[PDB]
Paper text:
DyPs are a family of microbial heme peroxidases that display structural features analogous to chlorite dismutases with an α + β ferredoxin-like fold. Access to the heme from the surface, as defined using a 1.4-Å rolling probe, is made through a distal tunnel and an open wide cavity.
We deleted the N-terminal sequence of BsDyP to achieve homogeneous preparations of recombinant enzyme. This form (named hereafter wild-type BsDyP) was used throughout this work. To investigate the structural consequences of evolving the wild type to 5G5, the X-ray crystal structures of 5G5 and the wild type were solved at 2.10 and 2.49 Å resolution, respectively. These two subunits have an r.m.s.d. of 0.31 Å between Cα atoms. The catalytic D240 and R339 residues are part of the tunnel, and three water molecules were found in this pathway in the wild-type structure (and four in the 5G5 structure).
Numbering used by the authors:
A (entry chain A): 56 to 111, 117 to 414
B (entry chain B): 56 to 110, 117 to 414
The structure:
Amino acid sequence: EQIVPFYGKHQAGITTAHQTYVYFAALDVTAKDKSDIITLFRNWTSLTQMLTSGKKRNQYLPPQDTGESADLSPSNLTVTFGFGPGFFEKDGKDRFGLKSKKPKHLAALPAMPNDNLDEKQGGGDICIQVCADDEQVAFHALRNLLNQAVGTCEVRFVNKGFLSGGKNGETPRNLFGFKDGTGNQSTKDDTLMNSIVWIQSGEPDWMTGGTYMAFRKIKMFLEVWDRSSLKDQEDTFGRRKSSGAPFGQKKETDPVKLNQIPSNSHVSLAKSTGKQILRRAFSYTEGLDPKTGYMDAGLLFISFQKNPDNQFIPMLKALSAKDALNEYTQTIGSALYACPGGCKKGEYIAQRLL
Amino acid sequence: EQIVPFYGKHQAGITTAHQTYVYFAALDVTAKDKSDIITLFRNWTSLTQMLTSGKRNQYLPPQDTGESADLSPSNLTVTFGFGPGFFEKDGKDRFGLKSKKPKHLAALPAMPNDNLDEKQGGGDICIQVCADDEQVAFHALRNLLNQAVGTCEVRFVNKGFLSGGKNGETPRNLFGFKDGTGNQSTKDDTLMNSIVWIQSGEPDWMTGGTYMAFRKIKMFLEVWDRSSLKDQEDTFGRRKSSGAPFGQKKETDPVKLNQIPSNSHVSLAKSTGKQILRRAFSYTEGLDPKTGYMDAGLLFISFQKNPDNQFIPMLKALSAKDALNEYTQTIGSALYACPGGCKKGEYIAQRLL
Ligand code: HEM
Ligand code: HEM
């Protein structure tokens, strides 16, 4: 029962229970003909469906499967696809006749204070989010999906993350030791998810049942953070580190009292925007940082909103300019993708290409 | 019941059951006084014992970074070793330990198909953090590395994974082959004492210890995935799906050497007549600049009581004629001497006194 359904009204991996491991990849389409892209997505639909279920010769041919996931369980594997702005208009030229179908809010995220964006660390035409409760299962799924795109796409970047939840179900803690996700509404609340995440109208029909996905690769200066006092740490966020409770409250789930937390507190500024998003982030570590000599670690920030201009960008502007966490963080990758709606069993992903 | 004992006759993490995740780090000692190193090892012993088992001033930084608070120890083990530079660095013996150097501790010989990065191998101290949860393991490494600031400088930090079968099958590496069939059973004390554990002939601090070989081997996943199934099985000498040697039925059947290729990986290794305890992990590190492909490979880690007799012969054989050379390139190399176990009232490598 470790299988997450692939076909559905929405794509899996958004309101799906947060897995432990993620591989996050972005592709740039190198094919000139649109029919190559339809071929891509057709084989991706077939492969993803095989990978997300338990579906398991000519010795002179390559094996159709790389093989490292053979004895493993699906471990709640989900794969989520999205389109960046470059898929519809690249350098002003709309190369596949899709400019008339561009999502209404799909564009590069605005530059923000404290940005240190690496251009090849964000963007892309296609993004693939592979989530699973086992890293080998997840890398295996991404590896075999990327192999299908050779000749059609060029891999732009590949990110890799983790986020462990509590043994008794406690909110998972990020690399600063604070629980991450209390502020999210319940993914089992259909009304709120339809109000925060899922699109019903106002978009091209392929976005119905879809959403927007924001990606920010945020470096976390662990060495500076670990020298900061516990009180300094609790004051940057506005919650007690151990319990995850707001200031002046008892438990994690008590409501936030804004007049009880600092003005430049992370939670204060975000909740003060009046907007909500669905945060589904993962932590990352990447060895040492050259010239820095410290652990290169941080957060792969991923959130889903039906209107990023109303829900995400106001929060980004607020946090970018005034935020105690900026003292310990620097965003180095940025991207916004449009996720199509779900895939019915007889169709292929994003079948608006026809 | 997810706890691996830290105190013992040997260090944990060598013959201990292979966990899923590893963080592998190497440090260079920047401290000039040997007593700063003794302090470091004491606090490392104290912290490690708290970390590997289950375990107040808001104005001070937290003594624990906290991200593992709600997690199980998940068989966390931490294993320590010393590189050659700890005993003699640039001709200088910096801590009066040259008279205590292990007999077989030295940099590994340069090999054909080597492409070594100097800062991807070597080091004076190595720390191996293994656990069945990556967050648990990184947390253990993070807080151990925090205690070394001002005493050591971190040389490199590697990060790996290796998942075993849902029903206990041998874990498969990123080439899809079962990896570990050839190791003796780590529950055979007689075999482990003959392959891994040191009994005599070494300084007393190595009694119950071993040597640890580290080879960071890049795996050209893109070349391998385009190769025929015949190329893949012929490079190893075992069937990919079953893990069986050629002309044999099951994975654990003995290898028939006259039925696998001469330059086969299993042929060359088995032909040395030597054995080691292989405890490796797979790694992935994003894309490779200039290559544009997945940067992945194997963190080769193995334990031998005599690297000059057991490991170096196998390296020479494989370096020259291994069919795996077509899909792999070693980019990091290191050999560490791991001290023996730690009794409850002592600290790691207490021979420093
Ligand atoms: C390294 C980067 C970040 C870290 C470590 C971090 C951590 C946290 C923590 C500990 C909380 C409080 C617990 C919770 O509500 O889950 C929180 C809340 C929140 N964060 Fe972040 N966060 C980061 C980046 C961001 C970014 C980039 C955004 C938006 C652009 C964002 C939006 C929010 C929101 C909306 C909340 C909930 C506010 C509420 O309670 O109503 N976070 N974050
Ligand atoms: C990317 C690098 C490597 C890969 C993918 C790899 C993989 C494998 C595989 C699939 C086997 C057969 C199953 C088994 O016996 O466990 C094997 C056997 C073995 N390999 Fe490796 N290996 C690599 C590097 C090395 C290195 C660097 C050494 C030694 C310097 C080594 C020594 C051995 C030994 C001793 C055996 C068992 C021989 C026997 O069957 O008696 N391997 N390896």
